[PDB]
Amino acid sequence: VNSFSGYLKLTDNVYIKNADIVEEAKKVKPTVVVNAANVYLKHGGGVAGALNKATNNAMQVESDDYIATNGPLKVGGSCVLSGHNLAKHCLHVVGPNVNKGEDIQLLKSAYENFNQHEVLLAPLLSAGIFGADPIHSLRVCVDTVRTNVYLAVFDKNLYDKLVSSFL
Numbered sequence: 001v002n003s004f005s006g007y008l009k010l011t012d013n014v015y016i017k018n019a020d021i022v023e024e025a026k027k028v029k030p031t032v033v034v035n036a037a038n039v040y041l042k043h044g045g046g047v048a049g050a051l052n053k054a055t056n057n058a059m060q061v062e063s064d065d066y067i068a069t070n071g072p073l074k075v076g077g078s079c080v081l082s083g084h085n086l087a088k089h090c091l092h093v094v095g096p097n098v099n100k101g102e103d104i105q106l107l108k109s110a111y112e113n114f115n116q117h118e119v120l121l122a123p124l125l126s127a128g129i130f131g132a133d134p135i136h137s138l139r140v141c142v143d144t145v146r147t148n149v150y151l152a153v154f155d156k157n158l159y160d161k162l163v164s165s166f167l
């Protein structure tokens with residue numbers, strides 16, 4: 001039993017809700033919140049910009065030190081950093097950005113990072129400003145993640161389409 005509330009159950013381990021991931025994380029304080037990161041951990045917009053703003057830019061400060069030490073992430077890769085005031089940890093995961101021409105096949109590799117954590121609050125990877133089809137992103141999530149994932153979908157219209165079209 002966990003403290004996530006109001007989710008629809010898609011499979012044994014995947015749940016979905018219309019919610020603002022920032023507001024969700026502040027309420028639940030999950031062990032892990034997933035960020036829709038880029039390889040440079042430059043949290044300018046989309047989910048990443050919103051999560052970083054909610055940390056008063058502390059996420060960006062920590063991320064800049066991470067990059068200065070380790071260099072960029074790989075597309076499909078991840079790193080674990082602090083969750084600041086939002087969660088214990090933030091799993092920064094880089095899905096392919098279709099608007100940069102990155103290979104959508106890497107979306108499965110991106111979701112595989114979730115399997116290293118027993119429970120996560122997450123967005124759909126490569127959705128929104130990353131330019132992938134969110135219906136596809138949900139399909140890959142369900143077919144790749146085996147741990148317990150609570151998916152927050154900000155847009156109410158998109159959420160209804162995701163549910164009504166889910167196979």
Ligand SMILES: OC[C@@H]1C=CCCN1c1ncnc2[nH]ccc12
Binds near residue numbers: 021046047128153
């Ligand atoms: O697929 C990512 C998704 C789709 C469109 C825009 C960003 N996205 C978000 N998903 C969940 N919570 C969010 N809070 C702020 C943004 C946000």
Ligand SMILES: [Cl-]
Binds near residue numbers: 045046127129
């Ligand atoms: Cl985004």
